[PDB]
Design an enzyme around this catalytic site. Sequence first.
Site, short mmCIF file in Angstrom:
data_model
loop_
_atom_site.label_atom_id
_atom_site.label_comp_id
_atom_site.label_asym_id
_atom_site.label_seq_id
_atom_site.Cartn_x
_atom_site.Cartn_y
_atom_site.Cartn_z
N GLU A 1 56.39 25.29 18.67
CA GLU A 1 55.87 25.85 17.22
C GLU A 1 56.61 25.39 16.19
O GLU A 1 56.35 25.20 15.21
CB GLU A 1 55.94 27.64 17.46
CG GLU A 1 54.87 27.95 18.45
CD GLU A 1 53.53 27.89 18.43
OE1 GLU A 1 53.10 27.74 17.04
OE2 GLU A 1 52.74 27.69 19.44
N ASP B 1 45.80 28.87 5.27
CA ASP B 1 45.14 28.96 6.44
C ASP B 1 44.12 29.95 6.10
O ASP B 1 43.17 30.18 7.21
CB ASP B 1 45.66 28.75 7.67
CG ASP B 1 46.57 30.12 7.90
OD1 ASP B 1 46.59 30.89 7.01
OD2 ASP B 1 47.22 30.12 9.11
N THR C 1 52.35 34.20 6.30
CA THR C 1 52.78 33.90 7.70
C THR C 1 54.15 33.85 7.87
O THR C 1 54.84 33.33 7.00
CB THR C 1 52.28 32.58 8.30
OG1 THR C 1 50.68 32.66 7.95
CG2 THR C 1 52.54 32.39 9.70
#
Length: 236
Positions: free
Chosen positions: A21, A39, A44
Amino acid sequence: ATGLDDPAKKDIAMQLVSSAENSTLDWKAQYGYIEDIGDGRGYTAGIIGFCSGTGDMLALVERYTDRSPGNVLASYLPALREVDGTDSHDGLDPGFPRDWAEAAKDPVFQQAQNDERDRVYFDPAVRQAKDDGLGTLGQFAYYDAIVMHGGGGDSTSFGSIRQRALAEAEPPSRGGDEVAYLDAFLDARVWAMRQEEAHSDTSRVDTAQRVFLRDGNLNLDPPLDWQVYGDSFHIG
């Protein structure tokens, strides 16, 4: 105290996920991370990418606030409740990213992040793996899968990946060979990654999980050497 629940093995799991990640073993560096990456999920943030648009950032801040009333993020709860389900920054900007970073200095927020990751991803994945009769590697494969694919009911969810594997091979809990089952699970995982993006980079399986499996490292014991996206990693 067994399998991935062993504190040393658990941290290895967190490092392995982080290599994919974040391209580093340093998973804790993400406590204070926060961006809207465009996105559609809004902000996030944190160690697993909690989002303002999907409800999990909201659940995290609610839990932090239960444990630490009047913390710096508490004032944002009305806004977080409102933008939930959308990519809106209404009520969050301009101060939210600054305040997120400040909160990340609080060991209590860090623990809240750990606990939400474990409630949603780690505990369910490890419990399901142990029920299926899998060793530490298998437990890790389930965890990496649920992290990327979630625990929903959709066609490429962790549950759906598992169902695909069970159709091809019996798990050890039902008398199946563990290696053959884990090969089936990894096949299903790769199938799902490709569904979600056609030209997906499947290295987190191909040059990591599949490699551990071929080496017979079923207990996930160091030294561990792998690649994800062409970067090499090592845990001695």
